């Protein structure tokens, strides 16, 4: 691998890595003919995310897939990239060199475990329900909810308006419900009455990255049980999240 990320793109890479942290504990790398693929999976196999980095810099491979501890690769971007250049190569050990200012250089020799790729069965085009809106808007829609809220249900109330409701399994809990109008959305193709329940803490991971980049997020959901598909696309950046949805007898496993 040969990467040379500079300018604001460096922080964008960091933000991306941070997002993959709030979903998985292991970072999967995989260079491709179209860009750099950063993937990850939930500990319960009920969540998946992927960031495709089409030439956001100066890419090149061979002269390669691998897997590192997500938290180890995170420490490199936690605050160290607060940095004008970033070189990711291979020696022998994933080498992440940081060309900071004043001449100070920060080289990172990260051990890993060469494995296989992370495939997963999706189909947004086959996903019955659909909606598209600015990330900034969705970020505001989740504010009323507690940061510790685990599960939230996305539903469609009568009147073509989306509704986020807190989910819980005589110490009754407070049920928060945010209601948004159809005018807040750039697209709303969902049947009234249909509602799914997924992980909020994970959904925030993507939403936080889509906001800082000022981009639009689109959600594709079906029936209670089948995973929900979240998608975001930029001029030279690509990413998509996939979370599990609760059902009747099962406990949200996919």
């Amino acid at each position: 691998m040969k990467c040379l990320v500079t300018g604001g793109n460096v922080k964008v890479l960091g933000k991306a890595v941070h997002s993959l942290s709030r979903i998985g504990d292991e970072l999967y790398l995989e260079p491709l003919e179209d860009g750099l693929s950063l993937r990850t999976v939930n500990s319960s196999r009920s969540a998946y995310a992927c960031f495709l980095f089409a030439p956001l810099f100066f890419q090149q491979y061979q002269a390669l897939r691998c897997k590192i501890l997500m938290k180890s690769f995170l420490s490199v971007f936690r605050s160290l990239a607060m940095v004008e250049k970033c070189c990711i190569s291979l020696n022998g050990r994933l080498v992440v060199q940081l060309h900071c200012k004043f001449g100070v250089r920060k080289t990172h020799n990260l051990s890993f475990q060469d494995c296989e790729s992370l495939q997963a069965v999706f189909d947004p085009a086959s996903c019955p329900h659909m909606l598209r809106a600015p990330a900034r808007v969705l970020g505001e829609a989740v504010l009323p909810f507690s940061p510790a809220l685990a599960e939230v249900t996305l539903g469609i109330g009568r009147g073509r308006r989306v509704i986020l409701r807190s989910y819980h399994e005589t110490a009754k809990a407070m049920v928060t419900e945010m209601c948004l109008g159809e005018e807040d959305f750039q697209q709303l193709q969902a049947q009234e009455g249909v509602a799914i329940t997924f992980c909020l803490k994970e959904f925030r991971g993507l939403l936080s990255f889509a906001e800082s980049a000022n981009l639009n997020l689109s959600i594709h959901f079906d029936a209670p049980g089948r995973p929900a598909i979240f998608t975001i696309k930029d001029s030279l950046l690509d990413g998509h999240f996939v979370l599990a949805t609760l059902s009747d007898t099962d406990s949200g496993t996919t």
Partner: protein
């Protein structure tokens, strides 16, 4: 009497002490020149804080040299008792008094008319090691700015039980390294850098100090303007910090650390 030290700005004393606060207790050594508080750990690390009598608005030492060990935590809590967020204009006065031996250390603070009196008992088992760190047997010496080392030590802490410091006139002019679970991270400092003030490396040297012993150095690093990283023949480390008072007068803080075999 035996020892009296008035001070119009307690921070001239409390601030520099905080840079040496990596242990519960500390040893005080006061002469005619001023006061000297020392804190050591594992008998492998020692931080020295010196405050010349010039800083005080009224210093006084009776007869010979007076010494006494004391709780640094309690002392610092007492000094900054009127809160640690005074705005430009408000100051707390201090009057320190210690009567030789068997007597508690007396503190007298005041702000806006509010006066507080503290009575901290002195407890002197002592037993303090003497680092023979002399300048005559110094191999390498470097003097860089404190801002650059901020992100260094801060994000330095790892699962690595050591911090490798290498100074050389060749390629790696000044490299800090760690080796933990994650792997190995290196931090270089090229010569001819604006962050580099002085550079006197005679020969390449590689030393490893238990990182858990140099972490507390940040308390002085983020509090100083310049830092003189020095290393002698035995391998011992010497961190000298320049801490300027809120009056302008400069003060010193020195860290010593033994290598790791």
């Amino acid at each position: 009497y035996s020892l009296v030290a008035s001070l119009d700005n307690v921070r001239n004393l409390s601030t520099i002490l905080k840079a040496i606060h990596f242990r519960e207790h500390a040893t005080c050594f006061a002469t005619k020149n001023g006061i000297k508080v020392t804190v050591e750990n594992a008998k492998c690390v020692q931080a020295n804080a010196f405050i010349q009598a010039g800083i005080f608005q009224e210093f006084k030492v009776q007869e010979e040299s007076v010494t006494f060990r004391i709780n640094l935590t309690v002392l610092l809590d007492c000094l900054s008792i009127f809160g640690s967020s005074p705005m430009p204009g408000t100051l707390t006065a201090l009057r320190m008094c210690y009567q030789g031996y068997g007597y508690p250390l007396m503190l007298f603070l005041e702000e806006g008319g509010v006066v507080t009196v503290c009575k901290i008992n002195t407890q002197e088992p002592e037993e303090t090691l003497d680092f023979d760190f002399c300048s005559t047997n110094v191999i390498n010496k470097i003097i860089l700015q404190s801002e650059g080392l901020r992100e260094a030590f801060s994000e330095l802490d790892m699962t690595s039980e050591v911090l490798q410091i290498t100074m050389s006139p060749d390629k790696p002019y000044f490299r800090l390294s760690t080796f933990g679970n994650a792997g190995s991270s290196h931090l270089d400092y090229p010569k001819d850098s604006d962050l580099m003030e002085a550079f006197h490396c005679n020969q390449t040297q590689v030393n490893r100090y238990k990182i858990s012993l140099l972490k507390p150095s940040t308390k002085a690093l983020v509090l100083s303007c310049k830092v003189s990283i020095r290393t002698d023949n035995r391998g011992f480390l010497s961190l000298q910090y320049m801490i300027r008072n809120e009056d302008g007068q400069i003060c010193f803080v020195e860290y010593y650390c033994c290598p790791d075999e």
